[PDB]
């Protein structure tokens with residue numbers, strides 16, 4: 028470690044810990060920046076050499092974390108929990124968690140190489156027939172094609188290409204990750220991830236939330252299944268079975284927005300998928316980012332700074348060079364550089380993703396002046412919710428009208444059902460997926476799911492919660508969890524489940540602050556400077572305060588609550604139930620064993 032980066036001496040008292048935390052702050056922004064910068068150089072340009080460099084930067088990060096970590100223990104281990112300064116307690120608490128810096132050097136290098144190799148496999152995997160990439164090629168197929176065989180070829184090709192080679196590395200990664208966090212006091216890595224919510228009843232509270240939401244999902248599923256049956260017929264859709272996992276618009280069946288045209292209740296009303304209009308009007312990536320920004324400035328939140336526009340990667344590079352397309356928002360920890368990296372496509376769902384990513388940036392802009400240890404969401408779910416809350420307003424027919432994307436205006440029960448149905452495809456359909464992913468990963472980290480059951484347990488959960496089935500036979504050579512970005516990239520998932528509930532709590536509160544008095548699902552907070560001030564208070568808090576209290580100050584309650592989401596969707600929840608009953612649907616999938624046949628001429 029460079030001499031300037033090494034910790035000095037501090038008295039072993041709270042006065043010393045404050046000086047310690049200040050000295051750490053100085054050196055940590057330098058260390059984080061080199062690490063983030065090397066990650067950027069790799070992710071926007073995947074080469075052997077960029078991986079080498081990133082690995083070197085990560086090693087320097089661990090060295091730093093180890094030295095400042097061990098000094099924090101040496102001086103403050105028996106006393107930091109009794110410090111008067113709550114923010115100081117949180118800073119020291121972070122610094123003394125070593126994670127992968129607990130590993131000896133050889134295992135640190137193994138760990139860093141595993142992350143790099145798993146990232147590369149995911150972001151460079153192709154399906155060959157001339158080879159299709161995930162983004163845009165396979166994404167477009169899953170979203171747009173209605174050919175059973177084509178969908179299958181993309182689904183199977185991607186799962187095989189990405190999943191199969193990851194499996195040996197994932198096993199090695201799990202074991203090392205566990206070894207690292209065990210020396211911080213956690214039974215397994217999952218326990219450390221869950222600790223961020225600082226709630227002893229976290230798993231039970233999530234389970235209770237899901238119990239309230241499940242009927243909504245069952246009704247949506249049944250209704251969509253029926254529409255798929257009308258299209259694909261009895262051979263490929265079982266009206267009492269799970270839906271084939273490739274037919275729902277998305278590689279992971281996680282959001283069903285893309286099959287809206289097949290399920291829309293009242294096709295005579297305004298077309299709520301404005302993708303056609305965006306293309307017709309010639310929208311590109313930077314228009315999408317600028318329109319998102321202006322929503323934020325309408326609230327008197329910050330614009331994107333010059334460094335964002337100069338640094339960001341907003342389209343897939345046309346020089347064909349390899350990049351991580353999966354959209355992400357970057358804090359370089361120097362209070363100046365902030366960037367999005369997205370292979371943006373001109374679609375309505377991408378417009379929402381742009382808002383999602385810009386929500387991350389806006390958090391980073393608002394808390395940049397906190398101590399480095401506190402530059403995070405009040406919990407991870409908060410960071411995930413910010414952009415989605417604004418996108419709830421943007422998606423409204425009224426708002427789309429204001430920005431030139433929906434010329435016809437209507438306010439009637441049919442138009443409302445269409446809107447709420449479309450939103451259900453994006454929000455309700457995701458809930459079981461958002462919930463299951465980390466149930467899977469928590470079982471893997473705990474050892475309940477050994478390598479010998481990775482795919483068996485994955486599909487158990489996928490069927491259990493989403494009521495989908497794989498459209499070709501799978502076995503334990505397959506590693507279908509690995510074909511989802513967050514697994515090889517070691518990004519936790521439960522945050523997205525929390526976010527999908529929390530965003531409706533946020534929406535409700537911001538709408539009330541805006542002075543809006545209509546139905547929750549027609550609220551648009553655009554240009555509410557009062558809504559803006561209430562959201563800014565959250566963003567400025569970082570992780571300086573318990574999330575329960577930040578939530579209470581914002582929405583008036585100190586807990587996750589499904590009631591705002593239920594209220595938002597209530598009209599369509601009622602309508603879907605009525606439709607399914609009148610069609611005599613079976614809710615659920617009692618033929619749990621059923622899988623579709625292969626197409627006759629597949630794949631030739």
Ligand SMILES: *[C@@H]1O[C@H](CO[C@@H]2O[C@@H](C)[C@@H](O)[C@@H](O)[C@@H]2O)[C@@H](O[C@@H]2O[C@H](CO)[C@@H](O[C@@H]3O[C@H](CO)[C@@H](O)[C@H](O)[C@@H]3O)[C@H](O)[C@H]2NC(C)=O)[C@H](O)[C@H]1NC(C)=O
Nearest residue numbers: 423424425426437438439543544545546547548549550551
């Ligand atoms: C779309 O239309 C709905 C429904 O409008 C209501 O019923 C229709 C059939 C018509 O007869 C309308 O005249 C009637 O308002 C609109 O929702 C309604 O909006 C108003 C707010 O502008 C609500 O009234 C307010 O209620 C609060 C109490 O909560 C009072 O403090 C206010 O004094 C005020 O009267 C009304 O409750 C609300 N009701 C429904 C049916 O949910 C909606 O605003 C409109 N949307 C758009 C985008 O134009």
Ligand SMILES: *[C@@H]1O[C@H](CO)[C@@H](O[C@@H]2O[C@H](CO)[C@@H](O)[C@H](O)[C@H]2NC(C)=O)[C@H](O)[C@H]1NC(C)=O
Nearest residue numbers: 068069071072073074075076077078344346348
């Ligand atoms: C992608 O990363 C590679 C490193 O793997 C970059 O290669 C360097 O490129 C500059 C300019 O072409 C040369 O002067 C260096 O000698 C290269 N290094 C090596 C080791 O080959 C490459 O430039 C990057 N591409 C982009 C557009 O950023």
Ligand SMILES: C[C@H](N[C@@H](CCc1ccccc1)C(=O)O)C(=O)N1[C@H](C(=O)O)C[C@@H]2CCC[C@@H]21
Nearest residue numbers: 281353354355356380383384387411516518523
């Ligand atoms: C597109 C988005 N990408 C992520 C990347 C997170 C990340 C974290 C660390 C390193 C690299 C990436 C995010 O911005 O949270 C994402 O994966 N998801 C999720 C997903 O697509 O699975 C669902 C969430 C709502 C809309 C977009 C969100």
Ligand SMILES: *[C@@H]1O[C@H](CO[C@@H]2O[C@@H](C)[C@@H](O)[C@@H](O)[C@@H]2O)[C@@H](O)[C@H](O)[C@H]1NC(C)=O
Nearest residue numbers: 187498499500501502503504505625629630
């Ligand atoms: C796992 O599956 C591998 C390949 O897929 C198989 O081939 C297709 C045509 C179907 O038969 C499908 O049901 C199969 O999964 C096999 O190569 C492999 O040997 C299978 N078994 C093991 C132990 O890996």
Ligand SMILES: [Ca+2]
Nearest residue numbers: 170285374376
């Ligand atoms: Ca779409």
Ligand SMILES: [Cl-]
Nearest residue numbers: 407519521522
């Ligand atoms: Cl999380």
Ligand SMILES: [Mg+2]
Nearest residue numbers: 282284285376
């Ligand atoms: Mg989509």
Ligand SMILES: [Zn+2]
Nearest residue numbers: 383387410411
């Ligand atoms: Zn996010």
